[PDB]
Design a protein around this nucleic acid. Sequence first.
RNA 1: AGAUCUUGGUGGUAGUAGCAAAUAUUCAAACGAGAACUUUGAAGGCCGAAGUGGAGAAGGGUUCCAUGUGAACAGCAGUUGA
Lengths: 107, 31, 153, 63, 50
Amino acid sequence: NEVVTREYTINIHKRIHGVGFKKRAPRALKEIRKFAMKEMGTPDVRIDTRLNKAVWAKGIRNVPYRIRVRLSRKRNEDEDSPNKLYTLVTYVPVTTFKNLQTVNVDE
Amino acid sequence: IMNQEKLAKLQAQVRIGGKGTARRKKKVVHR
Amino acid sequence: VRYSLDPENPTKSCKSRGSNLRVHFKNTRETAQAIKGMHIRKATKYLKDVTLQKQCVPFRRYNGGVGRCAQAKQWGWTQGRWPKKSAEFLLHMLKNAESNAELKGLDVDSLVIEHIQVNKAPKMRRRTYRAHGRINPYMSSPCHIEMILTEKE
Amino acid sequence: SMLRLQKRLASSVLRCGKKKVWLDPNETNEIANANSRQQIRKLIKDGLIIRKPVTVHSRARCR
Amino acid sequence: SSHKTFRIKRFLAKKQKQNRPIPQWIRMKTGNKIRYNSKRRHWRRTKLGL
RNA sequence: AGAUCUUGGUGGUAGUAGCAAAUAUUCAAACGAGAACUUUGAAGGCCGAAGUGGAGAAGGGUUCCAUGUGAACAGCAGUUGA
Ligand SMILES: [Mg+2]
Ligand SMILES: [Mg+2]
Ligand SMILES: [Mg+2]
Ligand SMILES: [Mg+2]
Ligand SMILES: [Mg+2]
Ligand SMILES: [Mg+2]
Ligand SMILES: [Mg+2]
Ligand SMILES: [Mg+2]
Ligand SMILES: [Mg+2]
Ligand SMILES: [Mg+2]
Ligand SMILES: [Mg+2]
Ligand SMILES: [Mg+2]
């Protein structure tokens, strides 16, 4: 299919390790976008404002280590655009990250 | 009056911010 | 207007021109040398790749301090860059030339850039301020560009 | 399209700073139609312009 | 300043009135030889005499 | 052909030095041909009342306000602007 939605967890700690203090949360946004692009094969990635707030929740340098996100590949078929598909990345609040798999989520 | 469809979308418009911000009171159009 | 190198058969050819264009003359010369002799489709996709930093233009004459890149090995050379403004200006000129070809009624799928030339335009003066109460020039280096495309397959 | 004038007028009418002026991000065209303090007052009455509350600075810890 | 004399205010008034572009119909006159107002003054580039 | 000659123009240097003082930006949307910079909303920060706040004197003189433009100027850009 091509309108699929899945739930992943991202090791922000792994992808941000080594980055300076004033760059950790912007680089976390960049790595989330890059992760979404690699997973769904869509250069158009929109990040939910709630997700951005979750990443910036603890300031610019103390980004959360792991984050549970939902990638939703959706039709861009609304106007003349180079990409007919796009990925909306939303925030999934969880209480623990133990034993969380990448899971297909239905409608 | 309020039904389930009206309530579920009303929750969106009254929230104009995250936790700890005042709720929207009204949005009235009048010509 | 008088181009240099008028085409041998000015019925299978189309022309494009631009004057006092606000791009750097050295970068534009290198990019024009890169795209010279190409097919029009190849040149268009190559300039788009240069904008996307997937193919470079080799800097052969104006290469003082230009860094090295892996994409320069496609060319027989070592120093290359990705002039975005030069690529976009030549893309606009290529679209204009293709529209001229459509107007002259010759199919735009067999066009080859046989002539492309970049001249220096009159410089434009700006002012910069130096250490001890001194004024120094801040000139721009615009360029004229011309190109003649020709049908051959 | 560019609501600098509307934010300034709303601040002047609401007697607050431009920090506390909230313009509806959805009714941008309707707010942009407002070019007078009367129209700003009408928008405030209609709820398209809202004065945000003062940021909480609690003295409970000090007490 | 805000406090000014009448002579100073009148001087500034004349400077304002003569700091404007030329009319368009001037360039259509016979033997014009005028392209633009070459006496244009900007308040930040060049300062007034007073 | 010279005078560290006068005036004007143009090179190499060189697409080089450089655009590194004062912690910091991010997400979405709108307008728009075009958005790192414009506007709006959300978030994270800074000035921290001896202020990066609110008002005056001197000095400036229309820079004030609205609308529009996108040539030049704002040492990147701009749909913004003293
Ligand atoms: Mg060198
Ligand atoms: Mg300097
Ligand atoms: Mg000085
Ligand atoms: Mg001065
Ligand atoms: Mg001589
Ligand atoms: Mg001699
Ligand atoms: Mg450099
Ligand atoms: Mg530097
Ligand atoms: Mg502080
Ligand atoms: Mg003060
Ligand atoms: Mg103004
Ligand atoms: Mg500039």
